């Protein structure tokens, strides 16, 4: 058993075109009735003479696995190594995929999803402008901590909570490759839900919409022990890349611009652009 040799998936090419000749009969493929809610299955071979053509095109790139299998920014934030405001020296982000527009719209084409997650972090630093900048500082180090719901939350950069004993964490040093991890399917339900037309309380009161099911936790980041004589600002970007994806119940893509990070609120928009008249084609 040194080699398994997985059988070929057998490239699935699109349907070919069969030769067709003149016809005169009672069959009427062209005529149908959309009232049934059934999309017609006619082909060009059924309405005009056609030659035989072998199609080698494939629909590989249109699979949901490939459609969603691209990393995308979902959040970015800034924190300073040293400053007067305690809250400004670290980040605290409740996890959610609704912050950035493109990735949100991509996901929102399906009602339910189920996938593994691959997370990558890009961190960069820069020296803040000022009157005196001459200083020497060794390489900086950063800590990323993930806090499942209900766990303790730090209140300052040097809090005791940063001594993770069960909470997973990553320590990263500048100059190396970006950090990365894999996250399994961690939903209490059988699938993630992008939409939820319901309330929180049983008497139809309280929070409404997909905000109710968002309980994925938080992410905290800080400089390990860097404390420069002069301020240094750092930025972190988070990238999500679904894997092993399955999707259900497609829905039409959104048309109106997003306006809230935890709601579907919008403003009415025209269906599409206009032209001179119904006959203009130039």
């Amino acid at each position: 058993g040194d080699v398994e040799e997985a059988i070929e998936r057998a490239v699935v090419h699109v349907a070919d075109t069969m030769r067709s000749g003149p016809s005169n009969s009672a069959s009427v493929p062209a005529l149908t009735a959309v009232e049934t809610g059934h999309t017609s299955q006619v082909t060009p071979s059924d309405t005009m003479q056609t030659r035989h053509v072998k199609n080698y095109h494939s629909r590989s790139e249109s699979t949901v696995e490939n459609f969603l299998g691209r990393s995308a920014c979902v959040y970015m934030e800034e924190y300073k190594t040293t400053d007067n405001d305690v809250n400004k020296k670290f980040v605290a982000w409740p996890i959610n995929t609704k912050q950035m527009v493109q990735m949100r719209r991509k996901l929102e084409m399906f009602t339910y999803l189920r996938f593994d997650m691959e997370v990558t972090f890009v961190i960069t630093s820069r020296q803040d402008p000022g009157t005196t900048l001459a200083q020497d500082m060794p390489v900086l180090t950063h800590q990323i901590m993930y806090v499942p719901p209900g766990g303790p939350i730090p209140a300052k950069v040097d809090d005791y909570a940063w001594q993770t004993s069960t909470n997973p964490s990553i320590f990263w040093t500048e100059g190396n490759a970006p950090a990365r991890m894999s996250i399994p399917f961690i939903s209490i339900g059988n699938a993630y839900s992008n939409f939820y037309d319901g309330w929180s309380n049983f008497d139809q009161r309280g929070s409404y919409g997909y905000n109710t099911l968002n309980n994925l936790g938080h992410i905290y980041v800080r400089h390990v022990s860097g404390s420069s004589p002069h301020p240094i600002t750092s930025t972190i970007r988070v990238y999500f890349k679904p894997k092993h994806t399955r999707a259900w119940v497609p829905r039409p893509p959104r048309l109106c611009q997003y306006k809230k990070a935890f709601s579907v609120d919008f403003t009415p928009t025209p269906i599409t652009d206009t032209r001179k008249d119904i006959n203009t084609v130039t």
Partner: protein, 56 residues
């Protein structure tokens, strides 16, 4: 325990893969599946309709 399979290429070629981690979530994306069936959304009717025959 290595897997050998073909790689995407018209009509004109093997790669080896090994898993190093004990959790299936760590595997690479399985983007080699191409099976599909659109009849679910295009022909959801109860009684099958022949294209040649009249709709009603």
């Amino acid at each position: 325990g290595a897997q050998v399979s073909t790689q995407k290429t018209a009509h004109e070629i093997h790669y080896t893969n090994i898993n190093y981690y004990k959790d299936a979530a760590s595997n690479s994306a399985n983007r080699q599946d191409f099976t599909q069936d659109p009849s679910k959304f295009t022909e959801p009717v109860k009684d099958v309709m022949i294209k040649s025959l009249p709709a009603l």
